[PDB]
Amino acid sequence: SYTLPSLPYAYDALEPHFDKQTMEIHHTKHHQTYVNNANAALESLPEFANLPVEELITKLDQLPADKKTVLRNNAGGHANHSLFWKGLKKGTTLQGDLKAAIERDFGSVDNFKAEFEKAAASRFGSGWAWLVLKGDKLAVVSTANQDSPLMGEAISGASGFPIMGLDVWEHAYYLKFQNRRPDYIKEFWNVVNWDEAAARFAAKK
Template structure:
């Protein structure tokens, strides 16, 4: 199976003014496309699904496969028309972080504190939401948690627009273009039995 570069779910210019069209094009059509090309060259006819490759791989194969997956998840995490968190999602944020604003503040702090390149994630472990960070191409352990949101803190994600001002990038993106509907769709179903 050949891994394909998944098209963006929006126009490259749609995230402006928070992420420029130039950054989106370079990020998706440059960096992510290179991970796809590199991975296909290394897989050489391997037909396994991407997550299977990630689970079994090491070194360069893992790095490229994980970066393809992480970037596909990133683009789903963003929206030019973000709306607002649903009531159920707000309740989850209240239970796990005290409020939606506290969640955003904690995610921004975690992403800012990630040393070097990596990712910050909102995950659900079955009992509640947590914030975690991963270095380089790593992703959360999918056997124990479900990713709900990610933000890329590799410099290529923000340097053209924000230079070395990572906190400013995080504030702009996470407070303005999070795809709340995507998170809501990924939430584990809660029991409706109130017995």
């Protein structure tokens, strides 16, 4: 069974960018539900229940047909949110190899930001925007609902190893921003953990 990971900071630690109320509800209610639902479907599947969630989502085709959608949605939700909490932190700065790779692949940091913002704003309905690594090149992509690029192109419509991501479901920003998703996206640049992003970039897997 999966368990809900504890946050690596307090609930008010991303203030004044991301609000304290949302952080608590997003973690304790939304993420908790995905963990609960994934665990429930997994009770009947002992062969898969032992796996790490990031590994389980790359093997959705191996699952039984009646379990596939529920695990794609819930284990996808667990994997995405787990990555999300680790990818947030105040006071980091984009530097080094990651910064150089971004400038190499996007022209400049500003071009990268514009491309990321455009992907994040254009995802209609629920979803996520991602900065992924693929073919030794960085790229910006987006997925629907709780799909991840780790699931592969056939399922998610995208692929590659996620370096960093932004949750664009309405629950992530509604309490503070309401319909103003672009304000939320602009505010995200203040809280992206560049240290963690650099760490994932260095690791590659």
